Enzyme design. Structure first.
Site, short mmCIF file in Angstrom:
data_model
loop_
_atom_site.label_atom_id
_atom_site.label_comp_id
_atom_site.label_asym_id
_atom_site.label_seq_id
_atom_site.Cartn_x
_atom_site.Cartn_y
_atom_site.Cartn_z
N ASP A 46 0.83 -1.20 0.00
CA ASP A 46 0.00 0.00 0.00
C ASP A 46 0.88 1.27 0.00
O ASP A 46 2.03 1.28 0.48
CB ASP A 46 -0.83 0.04 1.29
CG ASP A 46 -1.75 -1.14 1.45
OD1 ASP A 46 -2.09 -1.83 0.48
OD2 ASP A 46 -2.19 -1.32 2.61
N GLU A 94 -13.98 -0.43 5.49
CA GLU A 94 -14.49 -0.48 4.12
C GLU A 94 -15.90 -1.07 4.14
O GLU A 94 -16.23 -1.87 5.00
CB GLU A 94 -13.62 -1.37 3.25
CG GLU A 94 -12.20 -0.83 3.05
CD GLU A 94 -11.30 -1.90 2.50
OE1 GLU A 94 -11.44 -3.08 2.86
OE2 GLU A 94 -10.41 -1.55 1.71
C1 LIG Z 1 -6.68 -3.17 2.04
C2 LIG Z 1 -6.22 -4.51 2.58
O1 LIG Z 1 -6.53 -4.78 3.76
O2 LIG Z 1 -5.70 -5.30 1.78
O3 LIG Z 1 -6.52 -2.26 3.14
C3 LIG Z 1 -6.76 -0.87 2.90
C4 LIG Z 1 -6.34 -0.14 4.17
O4 LIG Z 1 -4.94 -0.28 4.40
C5 LIG Z 1 -7.04 -0.69 5.39
O5 LIG Z 1 -8.45 -0.66 5.20
C6 LIG Z 1 -6.66 0.15 6.61
O6 LIG Z 1 -7.29 -0.33 7.80
C7 LIG Z 1 -5.96 -0.35 1.67
N1 LIG Z 1 -6.18 1.01 1.42
C8 LIG Z 1 -5.34 1.97 1.83
C9 LIG Z 1 -5.68 3.39 1.43
O7 LIG Z 1 -4.35 1.76 2.55
C10 LIG Z 1 -6.42 -1.22 0.49
O8 LIG Z 1 -5.75 -0.80 -0.71
C11 LIG Z 1 -6.08 -2.68 0.76
F1 LIG Z 1 -4.76 -2.79 0.88
#
Ligand SMILES: *[C@]1(C(=O)O)O[C@@H]([C@H](O)[C@H](O)CO)[C@H](NC(C)=O)[C@@H](O)[C@H]1F
Ligand SMILES: [Ca+2]
Ligand SMILES: [Ca+2]
Length: 448
Positions: free
Chosen positions: A49, A297
């Site tokens: 990420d 999410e």
């Molecule tokens: C997902 C993942 O869990 O696989 O996580 C998101 C966040 O890191 C997570 O929801 C934070 O609690 C990522 N998004 C971001 C902006 O970091 C997703 O891309 C994905 F990675």
């Protein structure tokens, strides 16, 4: 069973496609014209990420119901490890305009280190993006012209992509690690749109000033899709799931929405606002200080009467569902836990289905049915009204009558769509960050 259809997976994105080594975070949508649009993060430096990457947004289209797909295009690309991450798709039926929203970070920023607030400042009644020089002095961008703290015009201008021009000559980009003027290091919500069924896309509009409050650190798109409300007085409202962190870093879900065809957006309350926890404690998303009640999410669907249901990633181990009686502006105080649906702390997808199943209105749901990102399972949930709330509103509950394992082994983020022929398309992370797989399934398969 006889007549069951589940196509063999196709790698719709994969290492080398568009010269990207990695891919993550699927979004999939069928437009009013019947075109499929698939969007994804083209993660250029590995799977990690933001901030440990350089991520662009890619899109492919299919005009034949997902049987063949175009060569793809990169539609947002910021320099120097500034990333766009987590896309979502929705269309306004009235205008035929397709929207794609995504979270954007300047170089060095991501979910965990996002700074407080919108990155905009009000001057004389309008919100302007702030920029900072090496000494920390604050400048504003007013109609793409940079002004200093005393409201003197400087020699700098910007564009929607953050390019930074000195007397009309590009010298850097306000999102890079080297620019003489830089945006605040935080998340921004970007929106692009297409009026030609996804063939061409606008440059990004930065809508943080409309939706991000001063106490939020991260505010990001919850990837997958949005909805446009069909029934009741909020008919036409475009609803896009999001989530944010407060000053303590704790996560709460919400939706942003627009009643004017995407020109203006507002954020509703979270289901964590005035939420009544199981034994009666009342919390709110601004003050939430504990991990356990976090809501992250999410994806949203609509009930027959227009009521919304927000399906949320959370820390309970099982699906959580919130209910809104006012088109996503607020939520009922009780968040339901559905112990029939494991939720291993991963994104999920849920969509309305257009046809009755067993005489009932239905939704289609996808997530990893496990205590890890594995055992990818697609479900058909039948909607039943079971009496009413104290306030007289109908109380709707889901019956997960049909459940089907579609992906043994790894299964993480996913996105569903109903196809023109009434079958279901699914784009899923069947690897951590390499091949992203697309399948089509019919109801006979899902019910088998
Ligand atoms: C997902 C993942 O869990 O696989 O996580 C998101 C966040 O890191 C997570 O929801 C934070 O609690 C990522 N998004 C971001 C902006 O970091 C997703 O891309 C994905 F990675
Ligand atoms: Ca880039
Ligand atoms: Ca509430």
């Amino acid at each position: 069973v006889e007549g069951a259809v589940k196509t063999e997976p196709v790698d719709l994105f994969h290492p080398g496609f568009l010269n990207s080594s990695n891919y993550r975070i699927p979004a999939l949508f069928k437009t009013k014209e019947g075109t499929l649009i698939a969007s994804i993060d083209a993660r250029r430096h590995g799977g990690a990420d933001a901030p440990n990457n350089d991520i662009d947004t890619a899109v492919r289209r299919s005009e034949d119901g997902g049987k063949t797909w175009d060569e793809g295009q990169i539609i947002m690309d910021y320099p120097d490890k500034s990333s766009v991450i987590d896309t979502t798709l929705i269309q306004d039926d009235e205008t035929g305009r397709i929207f794609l929203l995504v979270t954007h970070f300047p170089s060095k920023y991501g979910f965990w280190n996002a700074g407080l607030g919108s990155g905009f400042k009000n001057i004389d009644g309008k919100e302007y993006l702030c920029l900072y020089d090496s000494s920390g002095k604050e400048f504003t961008v007013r109609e793409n012209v940079v002004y200093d703290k005393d409201s003197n015009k400087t020699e700098y201008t910007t564009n929607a992509l953050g390019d930074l021009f000195k007397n009309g000559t590009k010298i850097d980009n306000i999102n890079s690690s080297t620019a003489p003027l830089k945006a605040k290091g935080t998340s921004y919500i970007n929106l692009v749109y297409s009026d030609d069924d996804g063939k061409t896309w606008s440059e990004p509009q930065n809508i943080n000033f409309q939706v991000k409050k001063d106490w939020m650190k991260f505010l990001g798109i919850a990837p997958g899709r949005g909805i446009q409300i069909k029934n009741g007085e909020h008919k036409g409202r475009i609803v896009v799931p999001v989530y944010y962190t407060n000053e303590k870093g704790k996560q709460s879900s919400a939706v942003i929405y627009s009643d004017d065809s995407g020109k203006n957006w507002t954020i509703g309350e979270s289901p964590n606002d005035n939420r009544k926890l199981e034994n009666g404690k009342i919390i709110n998303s601004k003050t939430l200080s504990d991990d356990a009640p976090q809501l992250t999410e999410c994806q949203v669907v609509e009930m027959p009467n227009g009521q919304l249901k927000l399906f949320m990633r959370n820390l309970s181990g099982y699906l959580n569902i919130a209910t809104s009686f006012d088109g996503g502006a607020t939520w009922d105080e009780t968040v339901e836990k559905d112990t029939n649906v494991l939720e291993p702390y991963c994104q999920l997808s849920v969509i309305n289905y257009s046809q009755k199943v067993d005489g009932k209105d239905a939704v289609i749901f996808s997530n990893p049915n496990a205590r890890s990102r594995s055992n990818g399972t697609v479900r058909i949930g039948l909607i039943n009204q079971v009496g009413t709330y104290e306030n007289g509103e109908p109380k709707y509950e889901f019956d997960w009558k049909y459940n089907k394992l579609v992906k043994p082994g790894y299964y993480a983020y996913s996105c569903l769509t109903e196809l023109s022929n009434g079958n279901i398309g699914l784009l899923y992370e069947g690897t951590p960050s390499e091949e992203m797989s697309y399948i089509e399934m019919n109801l006979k398969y899902l019910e088998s």
